[model samples]
Target: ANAERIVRTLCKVRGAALKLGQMLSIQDDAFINPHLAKIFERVRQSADFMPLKQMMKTLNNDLGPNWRDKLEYFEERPFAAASIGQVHLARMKGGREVAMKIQYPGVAQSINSDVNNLMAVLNMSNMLPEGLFPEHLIDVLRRELALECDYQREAACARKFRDLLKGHPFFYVPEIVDELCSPHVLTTELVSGFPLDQAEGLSQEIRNEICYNILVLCLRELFEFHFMQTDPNWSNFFYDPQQHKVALLDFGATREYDRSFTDLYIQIIRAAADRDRETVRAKSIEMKFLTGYEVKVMEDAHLDAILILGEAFASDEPFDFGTQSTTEKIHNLIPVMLRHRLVPPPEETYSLHRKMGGSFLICSKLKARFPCKAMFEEAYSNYCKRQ
Candidate 1:
């Protein structure tokens, strides 16, 4: 019992390990029990801030001789902290306002071990039910976990997403501060925006438009664009009330799908849009989202749920993401799938959709709408031509 708790605790302390936990929580409905699900959700919600003394030691140990030797000015206190690390407000020598996100010391080395130990504990302790976490699923996620620590990769990924939507008006991405960036440390222009949850002050009309815009953007990322920021954490978004824009952050988990996956995903969406059950089944099987698993939910009622969800996005008709009825529908959908024993498999494709779902969830929370159909149609038409 002690060993299992230790393993899970270590993983919680290790940021990448927590990220994997977040990944698992959202990927499948049957992945974990509700309590453990909440733990992962907490990790996804907040990051532990390292103390200034320890932070200084980390900088001296990794960067150079003097803690102050590196930056023009480093704030003693961090503005934000998380399971991965803490961020300090700093001014570069060249006079740029930047936030440096620093990882906890030795986390990169500890990530794989932490995850392995966590899984071992869960397995030995039987805290998790059978079939909750598959071995292959764990392995693949582990492989990806190591890469997230590579700040260089993350910076590049951030740039890619930023550049792809460079001309888009509704979206806002932070300016990457390349000069101050390092492999373990990332520096970016700090965004000024309200938190996603506290948008209550925003007028009802603007909230609706923004929410709709978000839904459409996610659809484009999944169906038309194919490249997506796979992490669904709402903190990844910042709303600039003045500009009426959504700022994007944390590109470490950005994902790009193969053409086959995108093609099939779009087919499924279009099929759902058209209420084409046969086409939906064919595409679902072709995607093989669940390997060698076909049950009644997948067989019988899956299409119905899918089409209903699609209606929230597909038609030009107003689908209110904010209403109580919509909330009830979402609440009801979970149990329906659970009762039918329909589980989402561990597929890279669904990660994009999870991000999509998360955006809509946030929108619903904000009660926002912004012409989702028009945005989706624009991206869809452009995307089809590219294909």
Candidate 2:
């Protein structure tokens, strides 16, 4: 019940705890029991609105007592609230509409303490039976949460994404309002659209286009761009049915990947697509995916997973993420993974997998079907030269 209580407490007092909660909902179950992970799913979906009094205090402190004067119409109530900050819909006196994200008081400073308390709770609940929550995991998460709290960093990330995706016709990235931004407050042009998950209602053609674009972007992020907005929260993406474009939101968790590391993954995917188990074995070890002995014993099972990974793009036909087969194959590996004395995945690999999982989860929710093989072949050919 400690885990449940921690989940409940985090929904009320979110910061790093809520961030971790969102992560656990998407993470591989090897890190935490799947049953316990469900508790945090609630944290991902809900949070208590910060009281009006506290919200006003934080705004005044970050934007000054005369902060209201800068805006023509600042909503007294936030249009949206989340773990680290709340977004208020407002209009500038100059007639520009913006979304003002006000960071909660002291969240930056409390990252460590909140994480420490979470570790204690996880340990107490026997969620981590082997005490397997690595120190680096907490350290990296703390650092990331601290980064998210810095509005300046997020604003820069948003600009980078906008610049990089300038002509991307199917995607919309908001422009940052630099002058109004501070360490605690971020202002950006308010873009309106429905939630990404709302795509379920669209027709098959539109759904296919959305799925294709999503998969294409994921590949581009991993192979071409190197810089990625790693947070895959559903709320961070919006679907504009009218414009038929996806709106990209929130860059607080953007990460840069090294070329060497990415190229290694590209090689593995290529090998997997070819159904070349020996190469997958060699590359998996090369990528530090397994110890040589572990691979020797788990060779068949590992290759099975690789084939499943490549299945979506191994044929010309469209892949149905709505089908249970792919999801089941992916899920089957968890027990096999838990059976082995698994090597700790590199932090970058973990982040990459999280993004991949999030994308798959989104597609599944929409029951999306698309020509993944064709799209992958195109993106892969453009990026990887078969070296």
Question: Using lDDT as the measure, which candidate wins?
Answer: 2
Model 1 spans > 4 angstroms off? 1-49, 81-83, 116-137, 197-201, 223-225, 298-305, 322-347, 350-355, 369-371
What is candidate 2's lDDT per residue for 105-193, written digit by digit as tens?
87877778877766676666665423145343476567667767867888888898899899888997888887678888888888777
Which candidate number would show the highest TM-score if scored against the true structure? 2
Model 1, CA-based lDDT: 0.61
RMSD in angstroms, candidate 1? 5.5
Count of residue pairs whose backbone atoms collide, per candidate: 11, 0
Candidate 2 residue spans exceeding 4 A from truth:
1-7, 21-48, 119-140, 291-306, 328-346, 385-387
Question: Counting only residues 3 or more apart in sequence or on different chains, how many pairs clash (N, Cα, C under 3 Å) in candidate 1?
Answer: 11
lDDT of each: 0.61, 0.68
